[model samples]
Target: SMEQVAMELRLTELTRLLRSVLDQLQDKDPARIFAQPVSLKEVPDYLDHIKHPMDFATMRKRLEAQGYKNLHEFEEDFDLIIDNCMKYNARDTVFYRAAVRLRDQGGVVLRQARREVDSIG
Candidate 1:
């Protein structure tokens, strides 16, 4: 239990430090420091950039399917994949960071999509 707690504490501290470093960069290059949310039409390419492309590759092949309508759906799949990764100690590999990166970027993309929908309604 203590080990898990310590792991979380360290993760929290790392998060704070990352934000601080990003804040410093924001001061120097505010324009370049932030990520521009990918558009709906860009979701396919965005998925390609992240891990587990094969899962969505079939949809990409289908003629009827356009890009994803909900970023949250992709997040759900990502959660499943990450759960499997943790289940098998896959997180110990270099690919662990890939999962995290996908998770973070997917969150931003989902938030952006929600904001756009809210703006329209």
Candidate 2:
């Protein structure tokens, strides 16, 4: 029985919290590689394999639109962004390592923020 205004408050708090999380994730991104979308010109075979391509810019936009319903939804897109990189890049590739680095960094930042926001539950 979540009232309209109560839901509004919930959504606002979550959005504010998520915005900070996304900002931190982008800040820790090495070489600003995750800042932009994957250009087809660069990775010609990219979209062929990656059914969904997620990037920081898109995530920012999604956040602005309040596209995320919950924290886990944001995590799903965030995970997709990293997972796409891990899957497309070879283990020996530099980007593969970069992707792993981003994932681990997110564990500390994302996980901690997750708890802070989840305390109500």
Candidate 3:
């Protein structure tokens, strides 16, 4: 079906793009903290400050399950993981430094992905 092909094509491009972005985060992430969810029990007040916590693992599952309807939706989650950490953690902490670097890289990467994907549309 035409509709099916459209959806399938979108998934392939976005998922592959997101997978690479997630991997880069892994290498830059100290202790791989952003690789998984923040522990609600360990930091009981985590949710109180960050209502929309996100992570690499969560984004991968979201990609695999095709939760992102479009590129913009995917972009938000990618940014969410870094911004949440930077906002919650202190400026001098390793979490902040790593997050800032990831945040900077993400801007460059996501823009290129969008430019390539949105072409001829």
Candidate 4:
């Protein structure tokens, strides 16, 4: 029962985070060429799509192959992405904000899910 409670809480938080991301996107410059911002759930996929710096491509593939299955699982990679962005002083880009949001808020789900699983054990 406790495990179920934890899972539900995690889902609720994830939904909230997604909505927040969507809300931010709504206020962004409508003149941009993205047409519409990618769906909240697709955030990580969107980031992976960019894969600048060449090294990002290699890191992404390795993580995927290692079964770090999703964006949440790729938390460390997200941090690296943010760090790289900061290193190159690209903080003004949309990618930097997106990466930071995912690393911080998206991380909530991972932590919650882990607690739920650990409780079951």
Q: Name the top TM-score candidate.
A: 2
Clashing pairs in 1: none
Candidate 3 minimal-lDDT segment of 10 residues: 21-30
- TM-scores, one per candidate: 0.38, 0.91, 0.84, 0.35
Off by over 4 Å in 4: 1-60, 67-74
Judge candidate 1 at residue 57 and give its lDDT: 25
Lowest-lDDT window of 10 residues in candidate 2? 112-121
TM-score of 3: 0.84
lDDT of 4: 0.47
Clashing pairs in 4: none
The candidate, 1 or 4, that scores higher on lDDT is 4
Query: Which wins on lDDT, candidate 1 or candidate 3?
Result: 3
How displaced is residue 62 in candidate 4, in Å?
A: 3.3
The list of candidate 2 runs beyond 4 A from truth reads none
How much does candidate 1 score in TM-score? 0.38
| Model 3, residue 30: C-alpha shift (Å) | 5.3
Q: Across residues 1-121, which tens digit of lDDT does each residue of candidate 4 receive?
A: 9998986666555444433433343234233322233443745554554444323344435543443433354445535555655554367877556556545653566565556444633
| Candidate 1 Cα outliers beyond 4 Å, as residue runs | 1-54, 59-74
Q: Could you tally the backbone clashes for each prediction?
A: 0, 0, 0, 0
Across 16-101, the per-residue lDDT of candidate 2 in tens digits comes to: 89999998898778588788889999889888899999999999999988888899999999999899999988999888888899
Candidate 1 C-alpha lDDT tens digits along 2-121 = 998976665554444333333332233223212222333855554444444322223222212323334344345435544433443356664455445555554554465456444633
